[PDB]
Amino acid sequence: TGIIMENVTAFWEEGFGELLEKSFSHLCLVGNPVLKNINLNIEKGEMLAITGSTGSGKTSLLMLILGELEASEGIIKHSGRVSFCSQFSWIMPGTIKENIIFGVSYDEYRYKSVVKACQLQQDITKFAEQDNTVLGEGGVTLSGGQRARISLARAVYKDADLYLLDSPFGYLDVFTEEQVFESCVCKLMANKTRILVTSKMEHLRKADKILILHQGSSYFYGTFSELQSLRPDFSSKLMGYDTFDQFTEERRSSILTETLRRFS
């Protein structure tokens, strides 16, 4: 399946705020849209890069696809299993391997292929028992990027038609993330429909389609080249840094926010 949204709007409802926490009642009382007039049309096998300002509705858009948020107006269409990799990297008690194949059946070629493309080999090779290493919930003594690669691997190992990847590339080990984006998202998953939330411009550059969000609104939908001509101010400033993508995630996101505020 591909995915289409035709003029979709979703309002704050009781619970969504608490769901997201993993005052809301005021937002629910005043009937405020969390997302307004969203359009997108992604074919089978394409990658959509979602970016925007902080708290612009990026995660909320994913929740709509998952059915955790209701589309009060408009048309959404997709079929098949979805696999969701949350910004929060959860880790269950058990080995690394058990965490990647959690609730699903081990297949040798599939496993090794996902391990390798998620750049996990460089990690497990530092441990005496490699992917048989036992973790506690939270996987608390690992780095953020290590937790995020195990969690991404878990999501990518699942056999689904649509992959939702919420901000996996947000940590300090920025060269590894560059390698993960190439080998996992661009190669291994080249023919899987996929939605990547991100604040790196390279990911926009390589995307089939682009969605920029600001304040629950679609600032821009289309291709990288349309961004460049249809949003010359935004693009000029964002392509203007020499290595924007190696800034911390907080800096990248604060530059996007400020830029979106400027050229609204």
57 is in an annotated binding site: yes
The answer to whether 58 contacts ligand ATP (rule: CB under 6 A) is yes
Per rule CB under 6 A, count of chain residues that contact ligand ATP: 11
The answer to whether 83 contacts Mg ion (rule: CB under 5 A) is no
**Residues 23-42 interacting with ligand ATP (rule: CB under 6 A):** 34
DSSP character string of 165-200:
EES---SS-HHHHHHHIIIIIIIITTTSEEEEE---
Number of other residues whose CB lies within 10 A of the CB of residue 81:
11
Number of other residues whose CB lies within 10 A of the CB of residue 4:
15
- Which residues, including other chains, have CB under 8 Å from residue 236's CB and lie 6 or more apart? none
- With CA atoms as reference, report the closest residue to 137 among 87, 88, 92, 99: 92
CB 163 within 8 A of CB 151: no
58 is in an annotated binding site: yes
* Binding partner of 60, given Mg ion, ligand ATP, none, CB within 5-8 angstroms per partner class: ligand ATP
Q: How far is CA 127 from CA 96, 98, 150, 206, in A?
A: 11, 16, 15, 34
Q: Cα–Cα–Cα angle for 219, 225, 229, nearest 5°?
A: 65
Find the residue with minimal CB distance to Mg ion.
59
59 is in an annotated binding site: yes
Nearer CB in complex with ligand ATP: 18/108 = 18
56 is in an annotated binding site: yes
Dist CA 144 CA 168 (whole Å): 10
Nearer CB in complex with ligand ATP: 20/188 = 20
What is the closest distance, in whole angstroms, from the C-beta atom of residue 30 to ligand ATP in the complex? 12
Candidate list 59, 89, 235, 259; residue touching ligand ATP; CB under 6 A: 59
Dist CA 193 CA 53 (whole Å): 24
- C-to-N gaps above 2.5 Å in the chain, after residues: 22
Nearer CB in complex with ligand ATP: 63/101 = 63
Per rule CB under 5 A, count of chain residues that contact Mg ion: 2
122 is in an annotated binding site: no
- Per-residue binding string, Mg ion, 17-56, x by CB under 5 A, is ----------------------------------------
* Binding partner of 21, given Mg ion, ligand ATP, none, CB within 5-8 angstroms per partner class: ligand ATP
The answer to whether 151 contacts Mg ion (rule: CB under 5 A) is no
The answer to whether 59 contacts Mg ion (rule: CB under 5 A) is yes
Q: Cα–Cα–Cα angle for 131, 177, 225, nearest 5°?
A: 145
The answer to whether 198 contacts ligand ATP (rule: CB under 6 A) is no
3-state secondary structure of 91: coil
Applying CB under 6 A, which part among 52-60, 71-79, 97-105, 218-226 lies near ligand ATP? 52-60
Binding residues for ATP: 12, 52-59, 87
List interacting residues with Mg ion (CB under 5 A): 58-59
